[PDB]
Amino acid sequence: GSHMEQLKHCNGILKELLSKKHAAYAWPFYKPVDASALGLHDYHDIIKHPMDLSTVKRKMENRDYRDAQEFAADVRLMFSNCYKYNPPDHDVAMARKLQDVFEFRYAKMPD
Numbered sequence: 001g002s003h004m005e006q007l008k009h010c011n012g013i014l015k016e017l018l019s020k021k022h023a024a025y026a027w028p029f030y031k032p033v034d035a036s037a038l039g040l041h042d043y044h045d046i047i048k049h050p051m052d053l054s055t056v057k058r059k060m061e062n063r064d065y066r067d068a069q070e071f072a073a074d075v076r077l078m079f080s081n082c083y084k085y086n087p088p089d090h091d092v093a094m095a096r097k098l099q100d101v102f103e104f105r106y107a108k109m110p111d
């Protein structure tokens with residue numbers, strides 16, 4: 001799915017993921033994780049490919065994505081980073097709220 005058509009759909013997803021309707025659970029993913037400031041010990045040992053929505057937006061604005069799948073890969077990388085580093089009952093609950101938005105809207109892509 002290399003179409004612009006599909007990439008436009010992904011672009012609508014990103015803007016919805018950055019909208020104020022989801023800010024309550026989404027804003028921890030707006031910018032890169034500041035592990036050193038937040039005392040996230042070993043964060044960059046355990047997480048070798050950081051990702052966040054500011055990075056996904058840059059890549060989308062620079063038209064660096066070749067198809068929707070690369071897009072999805074990055075968004076799921078961001079969520080996976082969160083699940084891998086944190087315990088199951090870490091306030092991870094915000095990631096699953098946002099991922100439910102992303103996944104349902106990704107599944108609705110034309111094709």
Ligand SMILES: Cc1cc2n3c(c[nH]c(=O)c13)CN(C(=O)c1cccc3ccccc13)c1ccc(CS(C)(=O)=O)cc1-2
Nearest residue numbers: 028029031032033034035037038040081082085086091094
């Ligand atoms: C992907 C991600 C983002 C954060 N992460 C944390 C643990 N593991 C993660 O994967 C993770 C630790 N973290 C918190 O625990 C936290 C404390 C106080 C209020 C919160 C409200 C919502 C979510 C987290 C917090 C905070 C704190 C602040 C920032 C924003 S910034 C520019 O300063 O880096 C990011 C995270």
